[PDB]
Amino acid sequence: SDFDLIVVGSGLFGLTVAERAASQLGKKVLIVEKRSHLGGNAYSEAEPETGIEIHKYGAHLFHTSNKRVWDYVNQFTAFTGYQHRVFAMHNGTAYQFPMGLGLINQFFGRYYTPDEARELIKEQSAEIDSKDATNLEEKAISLIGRPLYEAFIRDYTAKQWQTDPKELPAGNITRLPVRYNFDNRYFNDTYEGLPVDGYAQWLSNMADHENIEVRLDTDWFEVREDLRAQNPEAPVVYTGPLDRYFDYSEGHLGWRTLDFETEVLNTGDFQGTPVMNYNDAEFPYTRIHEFRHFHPEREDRHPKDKTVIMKEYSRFAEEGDEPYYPINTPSDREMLFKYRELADAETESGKVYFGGRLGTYQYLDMHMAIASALSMFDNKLVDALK
């Protein structure tokens, strides 16, 4: 046949499943993608005026402690030695971040040793027992105290969720967000970096295989009857929206979206760092990204007098908006269980598997999407494609 497997969507989940089927099982794979490009939200492109690599669906930082995933992705791109670090802007000062000896010194006014900082945090957080916390605000305070909470957590959290933290689940915070050393590596994973030649080259390399066909600007729901009629026995891996697949018969699942305001400025350097969080309520955006600093190794390709920045705004996703983060209200959770039952039945009757962020209503980092795809490949697809 012209294809043995159909993959709907070319995000990291779809790309991984397609590439494994193509290279490991020698199967012909047809990837159907609704957008004008590969890669889903991880896709990046050159900003036209400066040439700087930017993102239109959020900044993407790759990090993992999963060696299998790391070895896998390095087949398709090399990674720089980039390490993500973040600064937090509060009341006109850029704080070291996450919370640690650095921020603590800056905020409380003098140097605290590791042991002194431990003592300080116990004093500050004595007010509420975490076992007694009834919401996010209390849970935060019970861990780090009011001054730190009110300075670095309250408004940022309020902006991201568009909710007062007194109305958010105590379960949103599950561990002490404080380090008792000067380590401000943002992520804690064994492996970390950025694709040496950008995300677009990486994701394009994954789909670059003699056994893989890609059709861009193509909506699955507009072509599915025709495609499946060409080879009825070919299974489908669907990574589009789960609720949309079943005509919203159980309601619309709720998502958070993001707005990005991207500007080219007439300076070579706007903030001297890739990411600056804006922790104060007076700034409507949560953070500013300055894209050139994600790739300092490209400096003599970047302009000396211009830079691209991007302000990030969070809100509830309405019709038209890109769905990014599942909200997971108990209503959402309940119509999700209903959709899982429909999906499971569809797999049994129609050989349609459901995966990825949209297909399963679950936020997935890139390495988690890849791991999830590798698992579906191993445990489901190898058998379905015999």
Ligand X SMILES: O=c1ccn([C@@H]2O[C@H](COP(=O)(O)OP(=O)(O)O[C@H]3O[C@H](CO)[C@@H](O)[C@H](O)[C@H]3O)[C@@H](O)[C@H]2O)c(=O)[nH]1
Q: Which residues bind ligand X (CB under 6 A)?
A: 61, 88, 152-153, 156-157, 160, 277, 279, 365
Among ligand X, ligand FAD, its own copies, none, the one that 58 touches (CB under a kind-dependent 5 to 8 A) is ligand FAD
Size of site (CB under 6 A) for ligand FAD: 35
Of 259 and 297, which has the nearer Cβ to its own copies?
297
Concerning whether 312 is annotated as a catalytic residue, the answer is yes
Token pair 């791109």 in the structure block, residue: 77
* The token pair that represents 288 in the structure block: 């500013």
Among Na ion, ligand FAD, ligand X, none, the one that 152 touches (CB under a kind-dependent 5 to 8 A) is ligand X
Write the interaction track for Na ion spanning residues 100-139; mark x where CB under 5 A is met and - where it is not. -------------------------x--------------
* 129, HSE (Cβ side, Cα atoms, 13 Å): 2
Among ligand FAD, its own copies, ligand X, none, the one that 30 touches (CB under a kind-dependent 5 to 8 A) is none
Of 152 and 353, which has the nearer Cβ to ligand X?
152
Among Na ion, ligand X, ligand FAD, none, the one that 206 touches (CB under a kind-dependent 5 to 8 A) is none
Q: Where are the alpha helices (DSSP H) in 153-261?
A: 154-161, 199-207, 220-230, 242-245
Write the interaction track for ligand FAD spanning residues 31-50; mark x where CB under 6 A is met and - where it is not. -xxxx----xxx--------
* The token pair that represents 247 in the structure block: 């005509």
Annotated catalytic residue, options 175, 217, 282, 300: 175
- In whole angstroms, what is the distance from residue 334 CA to residue 250 CA? 9
Residue 353: beta bridge partners?
237
Concerning whether 85 is annotated as a catalytic residue, the answer is no
- In whole angstroms, what is the distance from residue 376 CA to residue 144 CA? 40
- In whole angstroms, what is the distance from residue 213 CA to residue 41 CA? 20
C-beta nearest to ligand X: residue: 153
Please identify, among the stretches 53-61, 97-105, 188-196, 291-299, the one whose residues bind ligand FAD according to the rule CB under 6 A: 53-61
3-state SS of 319-336 is: CCCCCCEECCCHHHHHHH
Which residues fall within 8 angstroms of residue 166, CB to CB, at 6 or more apart? 135, 136, 137, 138
Concerning whether 256 is annotated as a catalytic residue, the answer is yes
Of 44 and 157, which has the nearer Cβ to ligand X?
157
* The token pair that represents 321 in the structure block: 């908006």
- In whole angstroms, what is the distance from residue 234 CA to residue 385 CA? 8
Task: Catalogue the active-site residues.
Answer: 175, 179, 256, 287, 312, 363, 365
